[PDB]
Amino acid sequence: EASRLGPVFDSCRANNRAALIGYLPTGYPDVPASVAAMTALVESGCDIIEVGVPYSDPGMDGPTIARATEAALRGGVRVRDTLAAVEAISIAGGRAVVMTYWNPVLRYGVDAFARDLAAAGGLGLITPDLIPDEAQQWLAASEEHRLDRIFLVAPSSTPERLAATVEASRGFVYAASTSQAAPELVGRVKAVSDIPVGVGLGVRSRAQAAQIAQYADGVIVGSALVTALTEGLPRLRALTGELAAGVR
Amino acid sequence: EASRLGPVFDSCRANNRAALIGYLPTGYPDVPASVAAMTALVESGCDIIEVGVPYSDPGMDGPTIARATEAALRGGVRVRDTLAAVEAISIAGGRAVVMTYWNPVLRYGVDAFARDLAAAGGLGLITPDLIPDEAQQWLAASEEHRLDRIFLVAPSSTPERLAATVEASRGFVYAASSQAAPELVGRVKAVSDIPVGVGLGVRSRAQAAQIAQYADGVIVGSALVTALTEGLPRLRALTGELAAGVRLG
Amino acid sequence: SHDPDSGGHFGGPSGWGGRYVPEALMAVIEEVTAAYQKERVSQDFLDDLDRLQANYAGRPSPLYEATRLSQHAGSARIFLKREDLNHTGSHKINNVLGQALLARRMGKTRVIAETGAGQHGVATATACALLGLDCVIYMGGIDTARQALNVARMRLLGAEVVAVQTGSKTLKDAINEAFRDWVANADNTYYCFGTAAGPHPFPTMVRDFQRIIGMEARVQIQGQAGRLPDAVVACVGGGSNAIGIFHAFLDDPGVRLVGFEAAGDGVETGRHAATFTAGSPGAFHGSFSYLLQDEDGQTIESHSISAGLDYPGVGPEHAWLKEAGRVDYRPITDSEAMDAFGLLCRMEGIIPAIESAHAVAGALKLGVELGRGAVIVVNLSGRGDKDVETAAKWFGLL
Amino acid sequence: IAEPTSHDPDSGGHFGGPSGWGGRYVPEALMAVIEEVTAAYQKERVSQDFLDDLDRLQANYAGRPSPLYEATRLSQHAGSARIFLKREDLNHTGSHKINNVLGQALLARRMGKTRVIAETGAGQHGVATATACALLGLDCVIYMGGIDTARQALNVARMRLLGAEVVAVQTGSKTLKDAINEAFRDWVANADNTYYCFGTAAGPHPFPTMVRDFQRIIGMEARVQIQGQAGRLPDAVVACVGGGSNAIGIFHAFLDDPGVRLVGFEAAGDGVETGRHAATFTAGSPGAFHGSFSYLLQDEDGQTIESHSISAGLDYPGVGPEHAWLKEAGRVDYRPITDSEAMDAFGLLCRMEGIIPAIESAHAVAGALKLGVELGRGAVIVVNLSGRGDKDVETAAKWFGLLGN
Ligand SMILES: [K+]
Ligand SMILES: [K+]
């Protein structure tokens, strides 16, 4: 019955705070450095880590994340490096989901990717360009391998489509935005489901994270963590400590 | 009534020779120098002078004459400078006709130009882009002002058209071009007693003499221009050689 | 009968096509789909489109029997369907007149489109000027830097042109930007997609607007030759011109259909754009179809002397027709394409697009195969005015 | 069907009397070959089999009929008149010149000629001739001035791709006049096997009449179409005038319609008062030029004045003699259009209708806009859109500052 990330959002709402959800792309600036950084997120107080699979044609991603995934692909990152990253995070006591565009999953084999993500300790999959309309195979693999399925909603989503997207999600719903559009979008999910909702909104600071923990169950942060890692791993830890303290 | 040039050819045929017909374009290398060159032709033994009116779009002019006409125009040569050249040639004891494309004549006025050419001492007009079919105004002007009218015939000319062209000519008929030239002259002789001048890129005494066996006139142009470009003395020497060539005995 | 289901899938469980797009794109995609379903059966709309096809774009294009090619095609009879003579010089005018009319019916005041070397950009800007729509073309910065005259054509027609400096700075990245623009400006902007690919409804809609080529050709070949052709052939990039000419012949069982795709230096060299011959199934720009992709599913670089056959994907309806055995897809090299280019110039006085020269080269080969008197209709998708410099270099005339 | 001969010249080529316009102002040296072509064409122009050959190529190869397009978005700029564009821009090769070269190349093969020659300025007639020669398997030689060959690298390559030899004339001023001179001299030397494809409705008889015959089709199509779309004959039909072939082709079918005004627009360049123009009717006078008696730009001695226009195709100091006749007869009015008026029309047409016209054709568009203002709301004006503007994109882009430096 219960989702894989359910106990994490339970634990957060019992402690009067939102989950801090941190994205980094595998292979930036190289594969070992990216695992070292994902490990440092667990150590610095990230509740859930989004391990990004670099893709040659990312539609949804902003410029910081896109340059980083481009650099990663120039360095030879492979889809298997993402699964190794998920393994290392799990062993260090962290909670990992994978964020990926669908074609790499298709190339791997949907069933096989879910099997191998589950075997690595991964808890779920965020699917920025898979909609429930095309998710038949994924739904089955998700249920077979006990993985959460985080589909995205948007400000533009119709009432019909938003309800279907929430109904097809397990763990949390990613409310992707791109000032009062984020909270309205979250409100609309809440009126039809008790599933946790994660909000990403180019968060840079303690103050901005706190602003989002007021209405959202999880604060998602990607760009800023990648900018921070580029300066250095020490800078990433300090920033992650600021963001962990903001969600409380 | 006899043509204006008829006595020159009678006089030539009575001395067992062909007339030397020399062409130079007005204004090359400038207006005075061209007049000095034309006068020099008269002194060096030219029987008839063809005074060329430089025109902006010549079809018939070969490259030597086309370079010279272009230069004369760059020098600002006028159609009235050709009338002045004719006066000078007549004053030197010469005989002059004018060679010209038709548009300058149309622009001047055909009757007007025929009158002004006659007043300048000119004896005729050679009309390389005027065929008899378009020549009604010119025939009237030619008859009115007593000017000879030299049309061109070609190796390709049909019997019908060679007859009409010879019939419309007065003075001589210009047979323009290996064996094509004597055959063309033979075809003129079959239908008419009119004098025939031959143009054949003549640059030597020997070529003038070959042409003088079958033609009443030897026409020379390109070579005279080429000689003048070198200088006036080269032109005198060349003309002298050509004059010896037209004489058989 | 040949249409996909409501989700955009051809062939049921194979699942060719569909909508592999983010949820952020779905409001605007459903809005275009509903608007298209409504207008495709509206007589006012089909009338307006027909009037423009005839009076503005020059339709019907003629069918020309290229008798001086015959000796070079084993004495087969090559008939050229002359889309090279359309307004703007290619088949693409057909697509953009339909989509531009649709945009205006929808109340959209702005149209965007991607372009490679400039062909679809010029066509889209042409349609928008005609209908009074604002136009922004997206074009990769490697392309804008070496196509200054086509940029100027688009500007002359009243379009803005954005050089895209992201990713690999070419066609696919321009498309990636255009999709972002559409999401942000969905209230007022329509996206005029340039081939018979992308998420539903584009493969179906683009094909429906290119169907006229095949409908004319079928009538014309019967008129002139007395019978249906032995084969109909076309070049295949994303697949709009080929699907257009093929469609009317799908239910004629003796008509062979062959698509010819770009092999560059040769398929075995890795320097090609031969999606069916060397690619594999995958999701790309909203469509599940064949794709040039590495073993992790990353897009790979395609190569061809032809700029219009660069697209590393292919339309999902073609993938369906390959699976069903109805159409064959075959590789044509740069060399074969350019030899056919030259030959068409010298023999018929027709300077073909280098894209279209792939099809002509394929037709010559098929002529030798089928033999004397066989009738082959070839879609001559574009004129080659744009390719004169490329062709002149190839032949050492500069 | 062979069309009537009421507006034709006499057997000598004269329009309006036995010493009026046209004729043959050429050397005797050219007359054998001119008489041969004249007799060939008298035979073939009434031959149903020749007309069928030409019609078949017009239909299937060249894509006729060209459409008539009501350019509704120009109306506001033409005094709310209605501007109908006859779309010769859509012909194979992008202009009306294909109509001419198809006719003459067919006639060349009927005469047993194996070789065709022609000359060209910017390259357009050269490309058209080469195109028709490739189609009909004729050897093709194009004469072109060295100043034009060096400045038209891509049109020379077009012609060579089409299988023609391009002879760059490096003598004299190395321009169009030097190329014309070489083509005529080639024709005489090789008259046995060589046909000369003359580029416009000018030259000695039979060319003004022949070229016009091969362009008549524009006007014939346009008369049916305009009655189809407007419900009546137009108030005006207009066209640009270089040598005059596109204009005479569209005018001819309307000649016996006394309500239809006919207006030819000629290149005024920087302005007729500046002396940098090609306004033959406006500033020129009667004279013999290139084989016909017509109007030309000439100085007080009758030398040809150098002409100037932003467009290559209208940059010709003469005009066809049929036009001279139609001017003297009061049937057609000829009016000047500047570089600036033309370029504004070019730009207007790109933005408003999505059609990039040839700069030549843009002169007709510009004049049509002015004629619209004169005739007012609802007037119906047919404009010959003689070519497409791809060849002109670079010139227009510089004009409107789209290239920078
Ligand atoms: K047509
Ligand atoms: K003119």
3-state secondary structure D130-198: HHHHHHHCCEEEEEEEHHHHHHCHHHHHHHHHCCCEEEEECCCCCCHHHHHHHHHHHHHHCCCCEEECC
Domain total in chain A = 1
Stated length of chain B: 249
DSSP conformation letters of C182-217: HHHTTTTEEE---SS-SSTTHHHHHHHHHHHHHHHH
Residues of C in contact with D137 (CB under 8 A): 68
Asked whether D198 and D211 are in contact (CB, 8 A), the reply is: yes
Query: How many other C-beta atoms are found inside a 10 Å radius of the C-beta of residue D230?
Result: 17
Q: How many CA atoms lie within 13 A of B149 on its CB side?
A: 23
Question: What type of residue is C168?
Answer: S
Asked if A128's CB is within 8 angstroms of C298's CB, the reply is: no
* Residue B199, CA distances (Å) to B179, C243, D99 in order: 13, 70, 41
Question: What type of residue is B11?
Answer: S
Residues A218-242 as b/e (b if ≥16 CB within 10 A, e otherwise) read bbbbbbbbbbbbeeeeeebbebbeb
- In DSSP terms, C332 is beta-bridged to C262
Asked whether A246 and A209 are in contact (CB, 8 A), the reply is: yes
User: Closest Cα partner for D355 from C118, C81, C86?
Assistant: C86
**Ligand in nearest proximity to the CA of C63:** 1
User: CA-to-CA distance for D265 and D282, rounded, in angstroms?
Assistant: 10
The secondary structure of residue A195, as a DSSP letter, is S
Closest CA of chain C from D388, distance in Å = 9
For C287, list phi and psi in degrees, rounded to 5: -125, 135
Identify from C20, C23, C164, C181 which residue to disrupt to test chain A contact, counting A C-beta atoms within 10 A and taking the largest count: C23
- In DSSP terms, C194 is beta-bridged to none
Q: For residue C86, how far is its CA from the centre of ligand 1 (angstroms)?
A: 8
Residues of C in contact with D71 (CB under 8 A): none
Q: Is C178 on the interface with A (CB under 8 A)?
A: no
**Which chains are adjacent to chain A, needing at least 3 Cβ pairs under 8 Å?**
C
Assigned token pair, B122: 């000119």
Query: How many other C-beta atoms are found inside a 10 Å radius of the C-beta of residue C50?
Result: 12
Please state whether beta strands D291-296 and D285-289 pair in parallel, antiparallel, or not at all (unpaired).
antiparallel
List active site positions of D. 97, 119, 386
**Alpha carbon D190 to chain centroid distance?**
27
Angle between helices C43-55 and C92-106 (to 10 degrees): 140
- Break chain B down into helix, strand, coil percent, rounded to 5: 55, 15, 30
Q: For residue D62, how far is its CA from the centre of ligand 1 (angstroms)?
A: 8
Closest CA of chain A from C246, distance in Å = 29
Cα dihedral across residues A115, A119, A123, A127: positive or negative: negative
Q: How many CA atoms lie within 13 A of C217 on its CB side?
A: 35
Non-local CB neighbours of C288 within 8 Å, separated by 6+ positions:
A106, C15, C16, C17, C18, C20, C281, C282, C316
Matching CATH number, D15-62+98-215, of 3.40.120.10, 3.40.50.1000, 3.40.50.1100, 3.40.50.850: 3.40.50.1100
Non-local CB neighbours of C325 within 8 Å, separated by 6+ positions:
none
Question: Quick check: do D15-62+98-215 and D63-96+216-405 share a fold?
Answer: yes
Report the SS3 class of residue C6. Answer: coil
Closest CA of chain D from C144, distance in Å = 12
List active site positions of A. 50, 61
User: CA-to-CA distance for C341 and C384, rounded, in angstroms?
Assistant: 9
Residues of C in contact with A152 (CB under 8 A): 22-24
Asked if chain C contacts chain A via 3 or more Cβ pairs within 8 Å, the reply is yes
User: CA-to-CA distance for D2 and D4, rounded, in angstroms?
Assistant: 7
User: Closest Cα partner for D355 from D387, D401, D381, D402?
Assistant: D387
For A195, list phi and psi in degrees, rounded to 5: -60, 140
Q: Identify the closest residue of chain C to D355 by CA–CA distance.
A: C126
Tell me the Cα Rg of chain C. Answer: 20
User: CA-to-CA distance for B239 and A49, rounded, in angstroms?
Assistant: 107
Please state whether beta strands D82-86 and D68-70 pair in parallel, antiparallel, or not at all (unpaired).
antiparallel
Secondary element (H or E) of residue A150:
strand A148-150
Whether omega for the bond prior to residue D336 falls within 30 degrees of 0, making it cis, is no
Alpha helix ranges (H) inside D191-338: 207-230, 245-251, 280-283, 321-328
**Ligand in nearest proximity to the CA of D304:** 2
DSSP conformation letters of A87-100: HHHHHTT--EEEE-
**Strand arrangement, sheet containing B173-176:** B148-150, B124-126, B96-99, B48-52, B19-25, B217-220, B196-199, B173-176, B152-153
Q: Identify the closest residue of chain C to D128 by CA–CA distance.
A: C349
- In DSSP terms, D167 is beta-bridged to D143
Please state whether beta strands B217-220 and B19-25 pair in parallel, antiparallel, or not at all (unpaired).
parallel
Please state whether beta strands D236-240 and C9-10 pair in parallel, antiparallel, or not at all (unpaired).
unpaired
User: CA-to-CA distance for D66 and C48, rounded, in angstroms?
Assistant: 19
Identify from C48, C50, C56, C71 which residue to disrupt to test chain D contact, counting D C-beta atoms within 10 A and taking the largest count: C56
Asked if C152's CB is within 8 angstroms of D393's CB, the reply is: yes
- In DSSP terms, A218 is beta-bridged to A19, A198
What number of C-beta contacts closer than 8 Å exist between C and D? 126
- Break chain A down into helix, strand, coil percent, rounded to 5: 50, 15, 35
Asked whether D362 and D345 are in contact (CB, 8 A), the reply is: yes
Cα C221–C225–C226 angle (5° rounding)?
Answer: 95
**What range defines the domain where residue B190 resides?**
1-249
The secondary structure of residue D253, as a DSSP letter, is G
Closest CA of chain C from A219, distance in Å = 20
User: Closest Cα partner for C194 from C88, C62, C45?
Assistant: C88
Asked if C298's CB is within 8 angstroms of A104's CB, the reply is: yes
Tell me the Cα Rg of chain D. Answer: 20
The chain A residues in contact with chain C (CB within 8 A) are 55-60, 63, 66, 70, 73, 78-79, 102-108, 128-131, 133-134, 151-154, 156-158, 161, 165, 176
Please state whether beta strands C280-284 and C286-291 pair in parallel, antiparallel, or not at all (unpaired).
antiparallel
Q: Is D302 on the interface with B (CB under 8 A)?
A: yes
**Ligand in nearest proximity to the CA of D284:** 2
Asked whether A100 and C20 are in contact (CB, 8 A), the reply is: no
Report the SS3 class of residue D118. Answer: strand
User: CA-to-CA distance for D134 and D152, rounded, in angstroms?
Assistant: 21
Q: For residue D178, how far is its CA from the centre of ligand 2 (angstroms)?
A: 19
The secondary structure of residue A180, as a DSSP letter, is -
* Residue C379, CA distances (Å) to A157, B32, C216, C246, C258 in order: 42, 70, 12, 9, 11
Tell me which CATH code domain C58-91+211-398 carries.
3.40.50.1100
Non-local CB neighbours of C237 within 8 Å, separated by 6+ positions:
C195, C261, C262, C308, C309, C310, C311, C314, C355
Matching CATH number, D63-96+216-405, of 3.30.70.20, 3.40.50.1100, 1.10.3720.10, 3.40.640.10: 3.40.50.1100
E strands in chain C: 9-10, 16-20, 63-65, 77-82, 110-115, 134-140, 160-164, 189-191, 231-235, 256-262, 280-284, 286-291, 327-332, 375-380
Q: Identify the closest residue of chain D to B177 by CA–CA distance.
A: D29
Asked whether D98 and D62 are in contact (CB, 8 A), the reply is: yes
**Which chains are adjacent to chain D, needing at least 3 Cβ pairs under 8 Å?**
B, C
Q: From which experimental method does this structure derive?
A: X-ray
Q: How many CA atoms lie within 13 A of C56 on its CB side?
A: 24
Asked if C349's CB is within 8 angstroms of D402's CB, the reply is: no
Instruction: List the resolution, Å.
Output: 2.5
Asked if C23's CB is within 8 angstroms of A157's CB, the reply is: yes
Question: What type of residue is B72?
Answer: A
**Alpha carbon D311 to chain centroid distance?**
13
Asked whether D309 and D339 are in contact (CB, 8 A), the reply is: yes
Q: For residue C247, how far is its CA from the centre of ligand 1 (angstroms)?
A: 22
**C149 in the Ramachandran plot: left (φ > 0), alpha (ψ -120 to 50) or beta?**
alpha
CATH 3.40.50.1100 correct for C10-57+93-210: yes
User: CA-to-CA distance for C394 and D1, rounded, in angstroms?
Assistant: 46
The secondary structure of residue A18, as a DSSP letter, is P
Identify from C126, C157, C398 which residue to disrupt to test chain D contact, counting D C-beta atoms within 10 A and taking the largest count: C157
User: CA-to-CA distance for D211 and D354, rounded, in angstroms?
Assistant: 31
What number of C-beta contacts closer than 8 Å exist between A and C? 97
Stated length of chain A: 248
List active site positions of B. 50, 61
Non-local CB neighbours of A91 within 8 Å, separated by 6+ positions:
A121
E strands in chain B: 19-25, 48-52, 96-99, 124-126, 148-150, 152-153, 173-176, 196-199, 217-220
Assigned token pair, B144: 């009115």
Domain positions in chain D are: 15-62+98-215, 63-96+216-405
Domain CATH for B21 = 3.20.20.70
Nearest beta carbon to residue C349 from set D134, D350, D397: D134
